[PDB]
Amino acid sequence: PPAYTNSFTRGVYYPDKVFRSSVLHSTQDLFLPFFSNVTWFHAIHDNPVLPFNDGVYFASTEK
Amino acid sequence: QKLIANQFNSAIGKIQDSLSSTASALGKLQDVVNQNAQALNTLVKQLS
Amino acid sequence: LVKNKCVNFNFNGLTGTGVLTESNKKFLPFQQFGRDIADTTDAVRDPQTLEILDITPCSFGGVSVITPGTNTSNQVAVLYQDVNCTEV
Amino acid sequence: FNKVTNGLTVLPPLLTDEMI
Numbered sequence: 001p002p003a004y005t006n007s008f009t010r011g012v013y014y015p016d017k018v019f020r021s022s023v024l025h026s027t028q029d030l031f032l033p034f035f036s037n038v039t040w041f042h043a044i045h046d047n048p049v050l051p052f053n054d055g056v057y058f059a060s061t062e063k
Numbered sequence: 064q065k066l067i068a069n070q071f072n073s074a075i076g077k078i079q080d081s082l083s084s085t086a087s088a089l090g091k092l093q094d095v096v097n098q099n100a101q102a103l104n105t106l107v108k109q110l111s
Numbered sequence: 112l113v114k115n116k117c118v119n120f121n122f123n124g125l126t127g128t129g130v131l132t133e134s135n136k137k138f139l140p141f142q143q144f145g146r147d148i149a150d151t152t153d154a155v156r157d158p159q160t161l162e163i164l165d166i167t168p169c170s171f172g173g174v175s176v177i178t179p180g181t182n183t184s185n186q187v188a189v190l191y192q193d194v195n196c197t198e199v
Numbered sequence: 200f201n202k203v204t205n206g207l208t209v210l211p212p213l214l215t216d217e218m219i
């Protein structure tokens with residue numbers, strides 16, 4: 001029973017090599033829509049095979 | 064005459080703060096500039 | 112490389128023409144070009160030796176002719192609009 | 200003056216903000 005959480009603002013990545021400055025530039029590119037739910041996992045007594053769909057985020061939190 | 068001087072003078076002062084704390088007093092002039100720039104940008108981008 | 116001389120150029124496949132100059136502004140190590148508000152490719156990070164160049168338009172500007180009427184004289188003066196006095 | 204913010208040019212106005 002994977003229990004979600006709220007993706008918040010994460011998942012923005014520089015789509016290109018172009019430095020810019022102090023500019024608002026609008027782009028249409030595959031992103032993680034904000035505040036979506038993220039399927040969420042553990043290491044406990046948790047790694048199935050998940051579809052690639054379009055392309056996939058990922059994360060972890062570690063010591 | 065004297066009263067009127069003040070009513071003048073004070074009224075002068077308020078104008079400043081009617082400005083210094085409010086940029087939107089210039090809305091007209093402020094737009095004329097924007098619409099200009101708003102053209103060129105829209106014009107420039109047409110190059111792409 | 113040539114600086115302060117109007118050149119065509121190509122960088123990593125970016126092609127443009129301008130006056131290449133050293134600039135202070137700092138990039139993020141993975142970022143390549145610069146740009147501006149108008150999407151005008153501006154800074155460039157020098158691919159071999161990393162440094163922030165610039166670009167700049169060449170000159171352009173128009174030519175204008177300031178004359179008293181030909182009825183008076185054939186002596187004219189010429190205004191080059193918005194160029195430092197070098198090229199001419 | 201505080202409250203205000205390819206061949207494209209800006210020609211300077213004949214008059215200038217000293218003269219104006």
Ligand SMILES: *[C@@H]1O[C@H](CO)[C@@H](O[C@@H]2O[C@H](CO)[C@@H](O)[C@H](O)[C@H]2NC(C)=O)[C@H](O)[C@H]1NC(C)=O
Nearest residue numbers: 064065066067068069070071072073074075076
């Ligand atoms: C006429 O009106 C003016 C203002 O509208 C009055 O001037 C004010 O008078 C009060 C007291 O009456 C003072 O405390 C204020 O300081 C005055 N204003 C200024 C700017 O000094 C004036 O008194 C009125 N006169 C009559 C006869 O009614």
Ligand SMILES: *[C@@H]1O[C@H](CO)[C@@H](O)[C@H](O)[C@H]1NC(C)=O
Nearest residue numbers: 003004005006035036037038
């Ligand atoms: C996120 O999860 C909550 C509770 O499970 C649910 O109410 C909400 O509709 C979910 N939204 C998405 C986009 O998964």
Ligand SMILES: *[C@@H]1O[C@H](CO)[C@@H](O)[C@H](O)[C@H]1NC(C)=O
Nearest residue numbers: 178179180181182183184185
């Ligand atoms: C213009 O030319 C005519 C003939 O060449 C001359 O008579 C006249 O004075 C000229 N105009 C002026 C303002 O000098």
Ligand SMILES: *[C@@H]1O[C@H](CO)[C@@H](O)[C@H](O)[C@H]1NC(C)=O
Nearest residue numbers: 115192193194195196197198
């Ligand atoms: C013109 O170019 C010289 C180059 O030595 C520079 O010092 C000067 O500031 C320039 N002036 C203008 C008006 O561009």
